[PDB]
Amino acid sequence: KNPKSDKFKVKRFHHIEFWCGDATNVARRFSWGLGMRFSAKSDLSTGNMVHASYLLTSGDLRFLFTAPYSPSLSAGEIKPTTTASIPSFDHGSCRSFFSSHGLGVRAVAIEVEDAESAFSISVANGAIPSSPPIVLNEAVTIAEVKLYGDVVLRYVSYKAEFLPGFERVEDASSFPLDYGIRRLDHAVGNVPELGPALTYVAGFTGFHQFAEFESGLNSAVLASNDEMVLLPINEPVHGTKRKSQIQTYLEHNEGAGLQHLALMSEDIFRTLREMRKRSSIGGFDFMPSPPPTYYQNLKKRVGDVLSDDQIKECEELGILVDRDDQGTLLQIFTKPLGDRPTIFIEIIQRVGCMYQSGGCGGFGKGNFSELFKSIEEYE
Amino acid sequence: KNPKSDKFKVKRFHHIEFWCGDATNVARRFSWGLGMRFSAKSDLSTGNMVHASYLLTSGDLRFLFTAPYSPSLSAGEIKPTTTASIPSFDHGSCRSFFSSHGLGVRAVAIEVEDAESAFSISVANGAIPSSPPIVLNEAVTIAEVKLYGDVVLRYVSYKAEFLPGFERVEDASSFPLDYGIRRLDHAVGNVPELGPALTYVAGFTGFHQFAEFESGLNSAVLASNDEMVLLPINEPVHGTKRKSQIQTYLEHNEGAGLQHLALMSEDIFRTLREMRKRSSIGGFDFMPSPPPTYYQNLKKRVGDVLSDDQIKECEELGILVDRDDQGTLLQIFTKPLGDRPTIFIEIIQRVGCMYQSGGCGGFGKGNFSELFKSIEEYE
Numbered sequence: 001k002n003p004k005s006d007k008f009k010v011k012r013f014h015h016i017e018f019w020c021g022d023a024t025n026v027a028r029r030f031s032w033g034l035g036m037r038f039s040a041k042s043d044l045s046t047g048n049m050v051h052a053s054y055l056l057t058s059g060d061l062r063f064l065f066t067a068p069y070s071p072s073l074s075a076g077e078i079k080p081t082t083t084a085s086i087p088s089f090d091h092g093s094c095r096s097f098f099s100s101h102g103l104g105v106r107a108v109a110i111e112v113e114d115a116e117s118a119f120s121i122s123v124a125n126g127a128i129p130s131s132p133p134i135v136l137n138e139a140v141t142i143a144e145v146k147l148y149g150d151v152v153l154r155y156v157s158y159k160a161e162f163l164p165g166f167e168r169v170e171d172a173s174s175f176p177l178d179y180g181i182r183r184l185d186h187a188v189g190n191v192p193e194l195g196p197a198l199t200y201v202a203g204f205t206g207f208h209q210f211a212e213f214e215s216g217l218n219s220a221v222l223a224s225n226d227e228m229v230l231l232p233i234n235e236p237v238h239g240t241k242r243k244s245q246i247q248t249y250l251e252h253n254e255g256a257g258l259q260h261l262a263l264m265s266e267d268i269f270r271t272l273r274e275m276r277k278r279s280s281i282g283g284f285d286f287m288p289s290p291p292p293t294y295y296q297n298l299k300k301r302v303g304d305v306l307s308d309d310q311i312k313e314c315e316e317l318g319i320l321v322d323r324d325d326q327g328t329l330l331q332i333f334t335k336p337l338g339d340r341p342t343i344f345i346e347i348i349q350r351v352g353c354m355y356q357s358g359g360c361g362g363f364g365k366g367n368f369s370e371l372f373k374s375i376e377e378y379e
Numbered sequence: 380k381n382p383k384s385d386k387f388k389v390k391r392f393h394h395i396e397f398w399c400g401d402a403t404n405v406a407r408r409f410s411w412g413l414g415m416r417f418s419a420k421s422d423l424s425t426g427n428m429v430h431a432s433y434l435l436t437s438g439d440l441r442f443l444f445t446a447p448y449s450p451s452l453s454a455g456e457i458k459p460t461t462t463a464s465i466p467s468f469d470h471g472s473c474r475s476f477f478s479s480h481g482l483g484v485r486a487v488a489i490e491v492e493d494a495e496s497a498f499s500i501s502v503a504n505g506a507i508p509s510s511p512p513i514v515l516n517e518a519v520t521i522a523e524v525k526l527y528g529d530v531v532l533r534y535v536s537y538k539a540e541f542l543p544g545f546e547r548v549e550d551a552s553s554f555p556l557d558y559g560i561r562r563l564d565h566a567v568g569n570v571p572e573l574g575p576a577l578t579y580v581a582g583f584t585g586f587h588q589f590a591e592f593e594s595g596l597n598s599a600v601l602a603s604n605d606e607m608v609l610l611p612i613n614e615p616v617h618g619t620k621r622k623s624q625i626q627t628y629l630e631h632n633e634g635a636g637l638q639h640l641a642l643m644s645e646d647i648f649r650t651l652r653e654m655r656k657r658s659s660i661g662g663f664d665f666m667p668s669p670p671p672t673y674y675q676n677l678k679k680r681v682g683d684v685l686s687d688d689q690i691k692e693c694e695e696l697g698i699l700v701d702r703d704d705q706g707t708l709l710q711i712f713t714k715p716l717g718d719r720p721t722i723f724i725e726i727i728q729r730v731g732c733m734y735q736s737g738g739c740g741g742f743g744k745g746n747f748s749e750l751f752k753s754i755e756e757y758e
């Protein structure tokens with residue numbers, strides 16, 4: 001049941017902003033590991049004496065990597081006279097964020113019809129303001145409200161090139177990498193208690209609950225009107241045998257924050273082939289493959305959507321497949337993106353629901369015991 | 380004139396330690412950009428609840444990348460009960476270092492006959508203690524004294540595998556990259572005033588001055604007895620036409636620190652070919668090539684050591700060559716390794732002085748006007 005209760009008009013994920021200590025090194029690692037291209041920059045070469053920001057993009061996906069310079073470079077400026085292209089940026093907030101959380105996402109940014117109305121309506125419905133609406137170059141307005149822990153939801157709208165103040169990087173410094181990933185599918189937070197986290201976020205957005213046809217966690221998914229913007233949220237279930245990786249997240253992250261970004265690819269087999277080739281030469285590593293008892297048991301679960309030639313292809317790459325009432329889902333997980341066992345990336349491709357409807361296949365909830373039973377069948 | 384006045388027995392560069400905010404992402408970028416292999420680790424998988432440290436090595440060169448975890452993971456430990464494998468590590472120092480300087484070198488580590496005597500003799504001759512000698516697993520002793528700004532000189536000695544507490548990483552996670560770089564040649568600091576910086580460092584080491592057969596800077600080089608350990612130091616010359624890149628360093632770095640690491644390669648042409656191939660896919664970029672007026676004018680300067688077939692090879696890669704009284708030197712510079720225009724890397728190969736004697740060829744001092752005259756000859 002989709003009541004379409006969005007309190008304002010939201011279009012689609014716009015970008016994800018990472019707060020790091022060195023933007024260049026993280027951005028270069030991500031660029032090579034994920035086959036994202038170097039798109040735009042704001043830094044000292046563009047007159048930005050405040051922060052260094054680098055945008056990677058592939059398909060519609062935009063990853064923004066930001067880090068602070070020395071405050072001494074901008075000591076004489078004031079907020080109206082600033083050179084920062086992200087007006088919400090602040091040195092102490094950024095330093096306090098990275099020192100507290102390690103590498104992680106600061107903002108999940110959705111495009112809206114009008115950011116200032118989206119900001120006004122939001123706080124009027126309970127959102128905690130983070131940065132009030134600011135109009136950039138009479139062309140883009142930007143506003144931020146708190147989402148959970150230290151991550152904010154960032155509203156973006158254009159009257160009418162990424163953002164004012166950003167230059168387009170040299171064509172020779174830009175190399176057209178592409179491993180098939182195309183857009184952000186969903187972004188998932190971990191919180192100490194989901195109920196208040198849901199009430200608050202559903203409270204100011206009007207997002208509705210998505211259908212979700214020892215766990216380790218309890219989860220629930222928030223969705224815009226066309227179910228394109230999807231914001232799941234997990235919580236721990238204290239008392240299981242094996243300590244919950246959600247609670248593990250909370251202790252190493254110092255509280256709530258973004259757990260994983262799920263990136264959809266137009267060809268998951270080719271994406272995984274190219275990311276796997278780079279695992280040990282600077283890219284990303286993946287979580288251990290499941291035992292073949294799993295892939296042996298899958299013909300009896302998805303043999304209608306997939307030829308056993310390509311289910312074999314799934315066992316090579318360690319891909320995971322599940323199915324909901326309407327579609328089936330292929331998914332695999334990277335190991336944590338940095339030092340701490342916190343934020344990781346999911347690669348997904350969804351088939352069905354045709355002009356594809358959001359959420360087609362669910363989020364792999366059935367895999368918890370599809371893997372557990374599989375582990376048991378081996379031993 | 381080499382008086383051999385070293386106040387204690389120093390063998391050779393041991394390692395370089397980088398303090399970052401995320402050790403993994405910097406280490407992966409460096410590994411791919413420089414063709415260094417993943418060698419050893421100390422982190423949560425090795426029981427280290429304090430810091431994450433990753434060693435890359437190629438030839439005799441060892442790059443150590445360290446970042447702090449949340450202090451909450453180790454809140455109950457005390458210095459005798461610590462799990463840190465680098466006993467000198469401290470959370471506040473590390474966080475204050477990276478927030479102040481950006482990515483940069485914290486320690487230049489030289490191997491000695493006996494670290495505690497080297498530490499004792501050093502401070503007795505003026506060194507400012509940083510971390511007193513500590514014996515690791517009755518097998519390695521470690522001590523640190525201040526060198527300039529916030530970088531320390533780290534003494535290492537073995538009675539008799541990198542350091543106690545470090546495990547050797549899995550062979551499948553280790554990929555045998557190698558672009559020909561083999562050992563560290565010299566490491567160069569920038570300071571506000573060189574005289575006091577030299578007096579102090581020459582004061583506690585006994586290192587002697589190396590021969591150095593609008594500048595932009597004034598420099599001087601410190602050398603151990605066999606002139607293997609080389610510690611140059613630059614200072615600005617205020618008042619030139621173009622602002623001194625040394626002073627530029629000091630303002631963006633927030634004071635003194637390490638300016639460049641010079642890595643020697645067994646085949647600079649192949650090193651540069653392989654690093655250049657990766658410039659735009661995650662590696663390192665190089666400073667703009669010189670105009671061919673330079674390479675046209677070089678036959679009349681080094682045509683005896685190099686065939687014009689390989690001087691052509693030098694013009695492709697933008698390599699730079701100079702010569703001293705005994706040897707000739709090939710060198711090229713990377714752009715800064717991170718966000719700030721601070722620390723960069725030099726690649727070098729030295730021919731001559733044969734069983735090769737340190738410093739063979741100098742440090743490219745003649746290139747300042749070999750490039751200036753060349754720039755003028757074009758225009």
Ligand SMILES: CCN(CC)C(=O)N(C)c1ccc(C(=O)Nc2nnnn2C)c(C(F)(F)F)n1
Pocket residue numbers: 186188219220221232233260287333346363364365367368371
């Ligand atoms: C190998 C270990 N491993 C992942 C670490 C698993 O075993 N399993 C069973 C899964 C399966 C799906 C998802 C997921 O993606 N859920 C989701 N995505 N959006 N909303 N939700 C709720 C997650 C995750 F990522 F949340 F933890 N774990």
Ligand SMILES: CCN(CC)C(=O)N(C)c1ccc(C(=O)Nc2nnnn2C)c(C(F)(F)F)n1
Pocket residue numbers: 565567598599600611612639666712725742743744746747750
């Ligand atoms: C392209 C711009 N550019 C480098 C940025 C230059 O134009 N020139 C002329 C040089 C030449 C050599 C060295 C060097 O390596 N000197 C050294 N090494 N050890 N001791 N010393 C004193 C340096 C450096 F790296 F110090 F700045 N600059």
Ligand SMILES: [Co+2]
Pocket residue numbers: 186188260262346363
């Ligand atoms: Co997911």
Ligand SMILES: [Co+2]
Pocket residue numbers: 565567639641725742
């Ligand atoms: Co040099």
